[PDB]
């Protein structure tokens, strides 16, 4: 029914928000964990907390209540926050993958420039590019009621060839290029690890494979649905509107629970957390 849906939503909401605030407070108030990857992980945790807080309730509550009472300003703000945070998380994952590739496949030549200043420059460039990219959300996000009291806050894009163009652009720039880049980079890292205790290396490769397959499994349905939607419209809406799209977005937001567990809360770093 709906009890399992709200159950999973509450579970992932509490887990995401707690892990994210824990990682932010630790990596900010540790003062000794200032590596090159820890900056990227701090940016990822902040964007992930924003993802949870912005997207989860303002997607669930309007789906249960049947209407969107929150109004135009709230809808616009939440849409912009969703669009910014999703792309920031994706680009941060890609940046972490490319940094790991440069650090493990060519250590000497990358030792030159891999300093925390480079990490900060890349983080601020990622955030700025995301904010510049995701403005067409709020701009085209009006609130229109179809019927008495629904108000059905959706994206009224200008016309045809704008839904399709933007959907394909987002798909390519945030699912194909990032996914392929991460897969290639981690495959190469696995090769240079295979070249040359064998247990640790094979566990590392297993973890990298888990990361790639989890990213693909999570962010595939959400983008595929848009390809069906921005293209067709009523067919897709009729196909999955009430129950299935909620579970699809649940899969999407499960990345908020996955990222901290696979990036931060493993690897014995949590000794610093419990020590804090």
């Amino acid at each position: 029914e709906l009890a399992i849906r709200i159950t999973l939503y509450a579970v992932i909401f509490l887990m995401s928000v707690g892990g994210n605030m824990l990682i932010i407070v630790v990596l900010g108030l540790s003062r000794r964990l200032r590596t090159v990857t820890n900056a990227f992980l701090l940016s990822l945790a902040v964007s992930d907390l924003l993802l949870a807080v912005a997207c989860m309730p303002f997607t669930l509550l309007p789906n249960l209540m049947g209407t969107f009472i929150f109004g135009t300003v709230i809808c616009k703000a939440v849409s912009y926050l969703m669009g910014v945070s999703v792309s920031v998380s994706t680009l941060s994952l890609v940046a972490i993958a490319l940094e790991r590739y440069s650090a493990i496949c060519r250590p000497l030549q990358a030792r030159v420039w891999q300093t925390r200043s480079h990490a900060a420059r890349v983080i601020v460039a990622t955030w700025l590019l995301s904010g510049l990219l995701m403005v067409p959300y709020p701009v085209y996000t009006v609130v229109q009621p179809v019927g008495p009291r629904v108000l059905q806050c959706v994206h009224r894009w200008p016309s045809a060839r704008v839904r399709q163009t933007w959907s394909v652009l987002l798909l390519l720039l945030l699912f194909f290029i990032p996914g392929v880049v991460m897969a290639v980079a981690y495959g190469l890292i696995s090769r240079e690890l295979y070249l040359g205790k064998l247990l640790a290396k094979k566990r590392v490769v297993r973890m990298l494979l888990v990361i790639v397959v989890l990213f693909f499994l999570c962010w595939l349905p959400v983008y595929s649905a848009n390809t069906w939607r921005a293209f067709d419209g009523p067919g897709a809406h009729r196909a999955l509107s009430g129950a299935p799209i909620s579970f699809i977005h649940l899969l999407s937001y499960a990345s908020a629970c996955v990222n901290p567990l696979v990036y931060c809360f493993m690897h014995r770093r949590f000794r610093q957390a419990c020590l804090e």
Binding site: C55, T59, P62, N63, G66, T67, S79, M82, V86, V146, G147, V150, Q152, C153, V154, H155, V222, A225, N226, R229, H237, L240, S241, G242, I245, S246, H249, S252
Partner: peptide
């Protein structure tokens, strides 16, 4: 009604 679906 309510087609919902406000893309992620």
């Amino acid at each position: 009604d309510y087609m919902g679906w406000m893309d992620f």
